[PDB]
Tab-separated table of C-alpha atoms and ligand atoms in Angstrom:
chain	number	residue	atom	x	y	z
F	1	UNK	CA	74.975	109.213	117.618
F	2	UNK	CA	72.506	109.047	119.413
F	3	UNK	CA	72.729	106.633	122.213
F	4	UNK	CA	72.262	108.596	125.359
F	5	UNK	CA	70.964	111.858	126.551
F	6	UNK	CA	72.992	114.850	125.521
F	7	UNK	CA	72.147	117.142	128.344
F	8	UNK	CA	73.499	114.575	130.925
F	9	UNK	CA	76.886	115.495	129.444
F	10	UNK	CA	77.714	118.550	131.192
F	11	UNK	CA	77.500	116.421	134.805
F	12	UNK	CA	79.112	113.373	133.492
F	13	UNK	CA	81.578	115.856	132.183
F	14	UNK	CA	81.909	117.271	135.482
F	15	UNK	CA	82.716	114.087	137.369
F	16	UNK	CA	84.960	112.462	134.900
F	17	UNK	CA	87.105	115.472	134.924
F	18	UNK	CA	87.087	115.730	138.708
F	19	UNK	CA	87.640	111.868	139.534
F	20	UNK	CA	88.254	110.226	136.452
F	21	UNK	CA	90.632	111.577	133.407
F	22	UNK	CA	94.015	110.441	134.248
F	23	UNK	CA	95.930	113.898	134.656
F	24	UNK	CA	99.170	112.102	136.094
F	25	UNK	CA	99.837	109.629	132.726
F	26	UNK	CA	98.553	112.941	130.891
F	27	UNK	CA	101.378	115.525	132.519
F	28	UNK	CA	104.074	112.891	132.145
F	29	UNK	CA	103.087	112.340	128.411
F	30	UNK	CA	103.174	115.964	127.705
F	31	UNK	CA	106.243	117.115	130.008
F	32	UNK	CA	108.465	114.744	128.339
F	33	UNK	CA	110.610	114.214	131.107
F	34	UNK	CA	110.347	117.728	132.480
F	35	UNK	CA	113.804	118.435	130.541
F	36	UNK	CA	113.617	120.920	128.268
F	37	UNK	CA	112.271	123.881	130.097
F	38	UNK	CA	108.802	125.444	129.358
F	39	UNK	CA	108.177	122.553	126.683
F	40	UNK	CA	104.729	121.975	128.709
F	41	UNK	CA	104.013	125.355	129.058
F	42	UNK	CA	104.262	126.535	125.936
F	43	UNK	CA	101.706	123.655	124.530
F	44	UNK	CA	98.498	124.700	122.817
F	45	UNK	CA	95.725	123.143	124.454
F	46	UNK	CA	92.637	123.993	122.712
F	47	UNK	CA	88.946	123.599	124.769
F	48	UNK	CA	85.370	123.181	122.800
F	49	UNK	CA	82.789	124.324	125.288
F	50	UNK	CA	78.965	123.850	124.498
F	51	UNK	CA	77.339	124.501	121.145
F	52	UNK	CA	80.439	123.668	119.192
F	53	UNK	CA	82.188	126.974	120.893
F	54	UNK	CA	85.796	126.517	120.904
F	55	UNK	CA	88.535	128.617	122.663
F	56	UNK	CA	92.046	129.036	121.086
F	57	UNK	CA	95.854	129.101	122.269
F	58	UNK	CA	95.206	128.021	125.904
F	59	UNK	CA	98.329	127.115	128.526
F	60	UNK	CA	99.201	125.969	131.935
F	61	UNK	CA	101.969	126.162	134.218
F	62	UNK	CA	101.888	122.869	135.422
F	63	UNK	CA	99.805	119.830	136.316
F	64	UNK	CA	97.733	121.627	138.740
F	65	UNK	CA	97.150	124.378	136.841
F	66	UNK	CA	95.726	122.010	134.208
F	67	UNK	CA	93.505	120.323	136.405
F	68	UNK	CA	92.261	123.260	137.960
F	69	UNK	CA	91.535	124.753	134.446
F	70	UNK	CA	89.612	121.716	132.991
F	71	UNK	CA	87.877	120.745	136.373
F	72	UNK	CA	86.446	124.840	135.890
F	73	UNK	CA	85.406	124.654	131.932
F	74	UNK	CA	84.860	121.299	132.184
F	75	UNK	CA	85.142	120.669	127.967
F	76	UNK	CA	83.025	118.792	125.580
F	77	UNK	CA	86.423	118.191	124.055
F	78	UNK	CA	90.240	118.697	124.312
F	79	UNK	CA	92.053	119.811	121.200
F	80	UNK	CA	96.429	119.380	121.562
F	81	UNK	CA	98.476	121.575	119.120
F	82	UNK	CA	102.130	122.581	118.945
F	83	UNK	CA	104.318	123.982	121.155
F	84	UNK	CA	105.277	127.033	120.746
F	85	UNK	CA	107.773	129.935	120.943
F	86	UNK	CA	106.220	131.467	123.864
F	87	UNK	CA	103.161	130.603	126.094
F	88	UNK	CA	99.611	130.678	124.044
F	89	UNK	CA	98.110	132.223	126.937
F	90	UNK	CA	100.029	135.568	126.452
F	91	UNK	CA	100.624	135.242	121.628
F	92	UNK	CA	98.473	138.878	122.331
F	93	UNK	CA	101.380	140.260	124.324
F	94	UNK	CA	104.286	139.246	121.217
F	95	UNK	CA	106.114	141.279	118.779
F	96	UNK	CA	105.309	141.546	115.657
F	97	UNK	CA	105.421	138.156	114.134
F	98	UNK	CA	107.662	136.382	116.815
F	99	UNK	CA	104.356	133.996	118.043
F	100	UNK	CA	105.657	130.986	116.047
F	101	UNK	CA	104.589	127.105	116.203
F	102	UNK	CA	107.760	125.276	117.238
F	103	UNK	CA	107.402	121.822	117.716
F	104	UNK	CA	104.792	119.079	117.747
F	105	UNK	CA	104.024	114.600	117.457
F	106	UNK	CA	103.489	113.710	113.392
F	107	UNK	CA	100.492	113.099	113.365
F	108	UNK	CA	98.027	110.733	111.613
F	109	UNK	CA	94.224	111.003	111.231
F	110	UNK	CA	92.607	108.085	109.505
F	111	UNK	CA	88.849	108.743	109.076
F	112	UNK	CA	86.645	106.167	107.824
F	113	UNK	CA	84.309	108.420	105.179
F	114	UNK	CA	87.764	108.441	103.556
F	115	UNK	CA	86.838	104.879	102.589
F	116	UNK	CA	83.051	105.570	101.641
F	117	UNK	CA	83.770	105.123	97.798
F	118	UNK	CA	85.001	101.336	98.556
F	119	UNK	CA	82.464	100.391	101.827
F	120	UNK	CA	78.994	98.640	100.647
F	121	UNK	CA	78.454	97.521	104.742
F	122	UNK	CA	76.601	99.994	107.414
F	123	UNK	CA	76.495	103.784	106.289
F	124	UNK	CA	78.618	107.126	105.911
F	125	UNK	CA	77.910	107.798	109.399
F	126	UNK	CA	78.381	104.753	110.481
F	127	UNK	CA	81.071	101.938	111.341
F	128	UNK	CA	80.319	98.433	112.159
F	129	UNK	CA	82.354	95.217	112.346
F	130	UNK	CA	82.950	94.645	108.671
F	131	UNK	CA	84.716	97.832	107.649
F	132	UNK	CA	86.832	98.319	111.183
F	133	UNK	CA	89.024	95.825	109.265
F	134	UNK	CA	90.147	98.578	107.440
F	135	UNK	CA	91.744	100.689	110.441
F	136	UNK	CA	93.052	97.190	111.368
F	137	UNK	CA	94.943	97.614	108.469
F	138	UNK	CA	95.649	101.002	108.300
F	139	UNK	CA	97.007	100.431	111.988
F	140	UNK	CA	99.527	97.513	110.805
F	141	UNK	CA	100.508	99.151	107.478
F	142	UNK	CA	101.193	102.918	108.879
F	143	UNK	CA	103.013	101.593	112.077
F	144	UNK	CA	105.400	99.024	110.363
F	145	UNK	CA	106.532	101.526	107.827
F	146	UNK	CA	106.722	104.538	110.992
F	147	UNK	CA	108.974	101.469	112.788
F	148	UNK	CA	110.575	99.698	110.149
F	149	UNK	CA	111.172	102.285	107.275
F	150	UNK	CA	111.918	105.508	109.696
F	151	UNK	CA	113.263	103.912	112.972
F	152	UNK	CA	110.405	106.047	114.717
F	153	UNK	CA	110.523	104.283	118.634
F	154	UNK	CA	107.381	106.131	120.021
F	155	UNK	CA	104.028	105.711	118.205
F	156	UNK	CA	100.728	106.345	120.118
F	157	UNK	CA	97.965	104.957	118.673
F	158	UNK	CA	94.073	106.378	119.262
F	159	UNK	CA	90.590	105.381	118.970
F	160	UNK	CA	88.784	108.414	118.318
F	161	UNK	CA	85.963	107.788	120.233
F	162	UNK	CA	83.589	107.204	116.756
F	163	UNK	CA	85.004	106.773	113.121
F	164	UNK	CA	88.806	107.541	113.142
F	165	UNK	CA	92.408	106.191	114.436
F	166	UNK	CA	95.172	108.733	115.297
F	167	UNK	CA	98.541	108.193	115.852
F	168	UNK	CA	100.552	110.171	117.372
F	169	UNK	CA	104.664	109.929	116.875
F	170	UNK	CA	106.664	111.123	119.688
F	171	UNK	CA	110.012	110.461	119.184
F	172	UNK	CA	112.434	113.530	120.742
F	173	UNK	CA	113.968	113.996	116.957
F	174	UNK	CA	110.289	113.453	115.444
F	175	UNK	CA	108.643	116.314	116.951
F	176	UNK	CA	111.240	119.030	115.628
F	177	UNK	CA	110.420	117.631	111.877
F	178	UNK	CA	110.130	120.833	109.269
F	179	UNK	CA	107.201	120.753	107.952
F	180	UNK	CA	108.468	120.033	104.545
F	181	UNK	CA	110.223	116.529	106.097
F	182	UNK	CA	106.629	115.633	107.671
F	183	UNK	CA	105.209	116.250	103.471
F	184	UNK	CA	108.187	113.944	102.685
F	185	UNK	CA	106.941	111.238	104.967
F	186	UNK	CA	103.627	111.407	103.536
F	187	UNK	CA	104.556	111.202	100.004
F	188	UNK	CA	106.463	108.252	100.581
F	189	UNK	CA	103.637	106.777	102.584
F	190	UNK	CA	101.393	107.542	100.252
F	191	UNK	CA	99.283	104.978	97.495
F	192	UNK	CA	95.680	106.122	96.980
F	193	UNK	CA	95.668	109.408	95.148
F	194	UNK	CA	93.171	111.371	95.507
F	195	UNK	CA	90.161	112.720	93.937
F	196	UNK	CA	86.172	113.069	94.209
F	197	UNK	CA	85.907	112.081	90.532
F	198	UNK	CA	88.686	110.065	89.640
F	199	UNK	CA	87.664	106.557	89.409
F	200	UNK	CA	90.760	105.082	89.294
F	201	UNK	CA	93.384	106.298	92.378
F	202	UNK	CA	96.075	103.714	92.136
F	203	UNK	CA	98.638	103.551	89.831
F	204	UNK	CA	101.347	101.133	90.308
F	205	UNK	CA	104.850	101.056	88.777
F	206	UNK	CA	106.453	98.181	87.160
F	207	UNK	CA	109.092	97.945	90.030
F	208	UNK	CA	108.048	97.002	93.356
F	209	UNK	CA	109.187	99.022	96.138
F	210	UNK	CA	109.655	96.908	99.615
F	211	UNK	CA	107.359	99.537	101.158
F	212	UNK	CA	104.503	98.579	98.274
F	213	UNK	CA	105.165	94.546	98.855
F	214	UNK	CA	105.247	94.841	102.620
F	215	UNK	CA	101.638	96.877	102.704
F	216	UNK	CA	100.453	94.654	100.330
F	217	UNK	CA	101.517	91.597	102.212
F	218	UNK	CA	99.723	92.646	105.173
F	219	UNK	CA	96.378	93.175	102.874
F	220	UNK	CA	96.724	90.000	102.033
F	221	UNK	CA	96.212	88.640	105.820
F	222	UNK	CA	92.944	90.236	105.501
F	223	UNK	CA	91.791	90.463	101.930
F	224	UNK	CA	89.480	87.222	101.923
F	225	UNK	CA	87.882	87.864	104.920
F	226	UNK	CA	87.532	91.488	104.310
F	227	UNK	CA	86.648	92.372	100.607
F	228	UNK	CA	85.383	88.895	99.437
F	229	UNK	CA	83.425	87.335	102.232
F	230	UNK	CA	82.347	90.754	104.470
F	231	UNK	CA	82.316	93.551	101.810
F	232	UNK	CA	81.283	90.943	99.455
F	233	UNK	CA	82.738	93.834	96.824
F	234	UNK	CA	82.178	91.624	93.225
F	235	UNK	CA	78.301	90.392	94.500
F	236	UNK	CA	76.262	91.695	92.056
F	237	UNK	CA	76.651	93.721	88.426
F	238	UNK	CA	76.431	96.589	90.220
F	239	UNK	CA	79.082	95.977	92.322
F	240	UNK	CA	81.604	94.578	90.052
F	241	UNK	CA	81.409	96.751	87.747
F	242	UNK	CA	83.385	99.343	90.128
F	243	UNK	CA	86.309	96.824	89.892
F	244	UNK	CA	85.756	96.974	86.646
F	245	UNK	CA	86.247	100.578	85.683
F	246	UNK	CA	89.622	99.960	87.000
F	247	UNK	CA	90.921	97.485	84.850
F	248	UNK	CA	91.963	98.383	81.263
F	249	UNK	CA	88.791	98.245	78.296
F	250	UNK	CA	90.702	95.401	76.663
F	251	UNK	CA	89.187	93.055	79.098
F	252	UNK	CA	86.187	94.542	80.821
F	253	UNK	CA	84.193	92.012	78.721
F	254	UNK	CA	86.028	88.633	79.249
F	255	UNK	CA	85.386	89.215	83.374
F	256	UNK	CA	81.969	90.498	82.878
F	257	UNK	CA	81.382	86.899	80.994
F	258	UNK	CA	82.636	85.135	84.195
F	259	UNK	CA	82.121	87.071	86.723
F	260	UNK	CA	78.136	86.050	85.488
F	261	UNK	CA	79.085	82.297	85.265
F	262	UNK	CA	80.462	81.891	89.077
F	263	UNK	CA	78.536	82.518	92.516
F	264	UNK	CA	80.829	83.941	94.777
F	265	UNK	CA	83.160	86.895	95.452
F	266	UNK	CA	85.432	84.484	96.321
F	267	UNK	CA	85.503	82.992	92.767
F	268	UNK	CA	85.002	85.862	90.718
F	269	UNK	CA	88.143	87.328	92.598
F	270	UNK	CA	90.417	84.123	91.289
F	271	UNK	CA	89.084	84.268	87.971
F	272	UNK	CA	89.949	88.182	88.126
F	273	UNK	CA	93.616	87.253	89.251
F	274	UNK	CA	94.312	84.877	86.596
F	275	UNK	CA	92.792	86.931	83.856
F	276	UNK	CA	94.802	90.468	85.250
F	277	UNK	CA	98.174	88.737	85.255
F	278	UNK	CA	97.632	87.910	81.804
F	279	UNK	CA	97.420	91.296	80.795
F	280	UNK	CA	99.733	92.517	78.473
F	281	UNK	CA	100.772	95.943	78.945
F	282	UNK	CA	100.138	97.160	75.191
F	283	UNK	CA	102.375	96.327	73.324
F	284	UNK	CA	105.843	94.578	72.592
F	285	UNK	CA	105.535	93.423	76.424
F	286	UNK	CA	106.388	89.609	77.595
F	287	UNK	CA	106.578	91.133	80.787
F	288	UNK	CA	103.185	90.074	83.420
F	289	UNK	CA	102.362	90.282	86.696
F	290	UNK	CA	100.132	91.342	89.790
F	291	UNK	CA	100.043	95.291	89.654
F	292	UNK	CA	95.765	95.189	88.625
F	293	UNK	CA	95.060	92.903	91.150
F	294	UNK	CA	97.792	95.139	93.893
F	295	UNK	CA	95.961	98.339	92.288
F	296	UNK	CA	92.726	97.256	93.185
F	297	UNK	CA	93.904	95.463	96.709
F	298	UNK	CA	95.306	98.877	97.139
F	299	UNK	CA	92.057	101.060	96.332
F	300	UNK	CA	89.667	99.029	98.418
F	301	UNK	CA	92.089	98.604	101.742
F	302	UNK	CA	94.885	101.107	101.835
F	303	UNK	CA	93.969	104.316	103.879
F	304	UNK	CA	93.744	107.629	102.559
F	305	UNK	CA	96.590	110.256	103.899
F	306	UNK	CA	95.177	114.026	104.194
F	307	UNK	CA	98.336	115.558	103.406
F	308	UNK	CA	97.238	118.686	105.766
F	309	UNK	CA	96.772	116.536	108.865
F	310	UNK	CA	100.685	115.420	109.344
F	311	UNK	CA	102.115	118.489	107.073
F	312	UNK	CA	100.713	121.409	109.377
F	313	UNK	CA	102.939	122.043	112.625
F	314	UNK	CA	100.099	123.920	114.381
F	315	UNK	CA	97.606	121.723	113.737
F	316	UNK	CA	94.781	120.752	116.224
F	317	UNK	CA	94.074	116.812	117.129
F	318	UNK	CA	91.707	115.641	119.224
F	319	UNK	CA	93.275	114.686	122.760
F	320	UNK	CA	93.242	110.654	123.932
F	321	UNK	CA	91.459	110.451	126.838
F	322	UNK	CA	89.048	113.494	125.732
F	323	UNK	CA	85.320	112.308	125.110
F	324	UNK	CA	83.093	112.302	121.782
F	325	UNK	CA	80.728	114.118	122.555
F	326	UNK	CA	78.497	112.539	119.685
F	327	UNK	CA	79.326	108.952	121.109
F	328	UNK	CA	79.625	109.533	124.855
F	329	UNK	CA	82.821	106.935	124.388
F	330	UNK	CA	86.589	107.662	125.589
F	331	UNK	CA	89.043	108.099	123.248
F	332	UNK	CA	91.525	105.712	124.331
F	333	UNK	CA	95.188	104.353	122.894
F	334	UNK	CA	94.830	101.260	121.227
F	335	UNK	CA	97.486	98.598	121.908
F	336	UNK	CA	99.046	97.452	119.255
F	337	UNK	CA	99.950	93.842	120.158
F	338	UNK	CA	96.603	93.734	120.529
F	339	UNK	CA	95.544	95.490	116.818
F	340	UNK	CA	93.560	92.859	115.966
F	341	UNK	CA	91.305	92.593	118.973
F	342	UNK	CA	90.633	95.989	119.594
F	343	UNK	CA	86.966	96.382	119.854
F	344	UNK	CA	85.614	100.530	119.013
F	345	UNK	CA	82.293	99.072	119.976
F	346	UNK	CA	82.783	97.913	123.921
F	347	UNK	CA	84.976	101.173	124.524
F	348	UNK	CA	83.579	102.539	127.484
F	349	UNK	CA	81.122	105.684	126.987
F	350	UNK	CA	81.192	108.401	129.974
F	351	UNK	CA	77.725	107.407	131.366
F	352	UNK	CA	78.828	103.883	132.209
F	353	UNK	CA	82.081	104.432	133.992
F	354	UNK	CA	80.953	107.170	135.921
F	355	UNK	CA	78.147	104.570	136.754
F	356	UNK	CA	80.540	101.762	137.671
F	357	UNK	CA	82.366	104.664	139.610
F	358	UNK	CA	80.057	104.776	142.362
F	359	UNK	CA	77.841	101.472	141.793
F	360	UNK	CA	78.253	99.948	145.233
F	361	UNK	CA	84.087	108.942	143.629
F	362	UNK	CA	87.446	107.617	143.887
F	363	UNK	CA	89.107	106.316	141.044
F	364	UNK	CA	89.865	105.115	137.204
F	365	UNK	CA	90.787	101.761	138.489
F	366	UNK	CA	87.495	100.714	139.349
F	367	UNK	CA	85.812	101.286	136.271
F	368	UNK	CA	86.329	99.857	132.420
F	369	UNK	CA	88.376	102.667	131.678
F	370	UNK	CA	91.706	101.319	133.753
F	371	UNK	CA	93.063	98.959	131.026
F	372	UNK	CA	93.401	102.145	128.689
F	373	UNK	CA	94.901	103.817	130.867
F	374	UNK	CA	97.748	100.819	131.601
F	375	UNK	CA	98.087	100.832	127.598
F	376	UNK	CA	98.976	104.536	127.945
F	377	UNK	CA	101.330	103.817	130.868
F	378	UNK	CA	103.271	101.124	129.165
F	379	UNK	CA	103.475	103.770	126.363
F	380	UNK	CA	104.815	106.275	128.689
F	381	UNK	CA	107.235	104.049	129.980
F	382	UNK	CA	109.008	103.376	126.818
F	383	UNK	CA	109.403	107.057	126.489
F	384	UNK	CA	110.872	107.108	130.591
F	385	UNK	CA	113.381	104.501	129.336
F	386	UNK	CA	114.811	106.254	126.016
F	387	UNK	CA	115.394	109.631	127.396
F	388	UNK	CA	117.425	107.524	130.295
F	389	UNK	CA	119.191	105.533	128.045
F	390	UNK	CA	119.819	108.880	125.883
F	391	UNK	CA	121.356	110.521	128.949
F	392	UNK	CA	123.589	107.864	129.451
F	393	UNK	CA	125.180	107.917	126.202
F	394	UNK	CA	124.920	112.229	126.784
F	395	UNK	CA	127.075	111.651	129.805
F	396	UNK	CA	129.610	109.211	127.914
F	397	UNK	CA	130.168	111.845	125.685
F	398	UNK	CA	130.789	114.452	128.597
F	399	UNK	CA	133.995	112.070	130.123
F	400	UNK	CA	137.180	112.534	127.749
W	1	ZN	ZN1	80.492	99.202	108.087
């Protein structure tokens, strides 16, 4: 924003759609097996055409229809909501109140200006290669919990072309979740609460939860690197003194005293460690330990949950393989093996692999987009081989 042309959009636009966005990967994705009837054609889509005009409760019949529909708008960018009770295309014709959001993914939306009040790097508009740490994290933290502490099997993640990571969870069982269940995930999920002008937003108990240790543990992989040597977050008085207003009064000015007398972040932070599990928890106590230095760990590298995002059934999220319009770049699934060399800042924009498409229009495998789209695939696989493997046990059950 701004690194090519915006009126060159509508034509690259035009040819990505007609040669380029993977509609085969897309269709299986979003007809789940093709099993439960009308589940694709009762999906929102939702279009945004030029000057931020969007279009509402779209549908298609099929594949084709999709195609045909997208390859005629051609879309600045593709919104995906819920599936509903009855096509989208036809709420108007509906009784009464019957129009109702059935089904969709939990969704996550982690957006870096959600981290603005603990990022000294690049800018609010900005990202750069000292704060993408934090999706890094956000990415290993979110996903080991939606694995390890749900049993969720199906978790796309998403680069969002610019300043965010989505996931999207999949799982058959998953995307009939009551709204109030999705809250519940959340909640538990949930560490840095929550306010404009609350300084401090972490508040840790005296008992450790396994969910608690095992985010914390994985901040810990990155905490040096991150917060001491790239943030560089206790530099100067200015700095430090945000840590600062989160530790108690009783010993703001014992750190301020040597936080002056050492050089580095990195030093500062050990002397902060020490002096924080020597805290005594007024009065009566005997009881120490690491819940300052986990509080501020927490505040400076846990990401923030909008409870809206992953509560709301009906809810619209930007579709992978859709473009950012502000960017030009693809947003593409991120493979998590690979979490911690996925690079925003090579993801292909629009311009450059309709470029390589015709540099001496065919197809997605010769340009930069194609590994992506085999991240997607492998994805889409593991959902072809748990609805088998569900269908098997299905027809066990059917023998007796
Ligand atoms: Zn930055």
């Amino acid at each position: 924003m701004e690194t090519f042309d915006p009126t060159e959009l509508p034509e690259l636009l035009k040819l990505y759609y007609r040669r380029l966005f993977p509609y085969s990967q897309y269709y299986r994705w979003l007809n789940y097996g093709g099993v439960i009837k009308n589940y694709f054609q009762h999906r929102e889509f939702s279009f945004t055409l030029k000057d931020d005009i969007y279009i509402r409760y779209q549908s298609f019949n099929n594949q084709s229809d999709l195609e045909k529909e997208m390859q005629k708008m051609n879309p600045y960018k593709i919104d995906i909501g819920a599936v509903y009770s009855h096509r989208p295309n036809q709420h108007n014709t509906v009784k009464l109140g019957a129009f109702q959001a059935q089904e969709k993914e939990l969704v996550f939306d982690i957006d870096m200006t959600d981290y603005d009040d603990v990022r000294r790097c690049c800018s609010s508009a900005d990202i750069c290669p000292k704060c993408w740490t934090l999706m890094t994290m956000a990415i290993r933290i979110i996903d080991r919990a939606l694995k390890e502490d749900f049993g969720f099997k199906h978790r796309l993640w998403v680069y969002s072309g610019r300043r965010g990571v989505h996931c999207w969870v999949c799982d058959e069982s998953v995307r009939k979740l009551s709204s109030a269940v999705r809250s519940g995930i959340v909640e538990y999920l949930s560490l840095v609460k929550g306010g404009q002008d609350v300084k401090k937003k972490v508040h840790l108990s005296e008992k450790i939860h396994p969910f608690i240790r095992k985010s914390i543990n994985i901040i810990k992989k990155y905490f040096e690197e991150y917060a001491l040597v790239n943030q560089d977050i206790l530099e100067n008085k200015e700095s430090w003194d945000k840590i600062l207003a989160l530790v108690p009064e009783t010993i703001h000015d014992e750190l301020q005293q040597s936080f002056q007398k050492s050089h580095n972040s990195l030093q500062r932070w050990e002397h902060l460690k020490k002096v924080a599990s020597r805290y005594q928890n007024n009065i009566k106590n005997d009881k120490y330990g690491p819940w300052l230095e986990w509080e501020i760990m927490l505040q400076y590298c846990f990401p923030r949950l909008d409870i809206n995002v992953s509560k709301g059934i009906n809810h619209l999220l930007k579709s992978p393989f859709s473009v950012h319009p502000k960017t030009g770049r693809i947003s593409v699934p991120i493979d998590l093996q690979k979490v911690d060399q996925f690079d925003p800042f090579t993801v292909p924009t629009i311009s450059f692999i309709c470029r390589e498409l015709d540099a001496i229009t065919r197809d997605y495998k010769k340009t930069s987009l194609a590994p992506y789209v085999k991240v997607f695939e492998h994805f889409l696989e593991n959902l072809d081989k748990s609805r088998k493997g569900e269908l098997l046990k299905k027809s066990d059950l059917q023998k007796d």
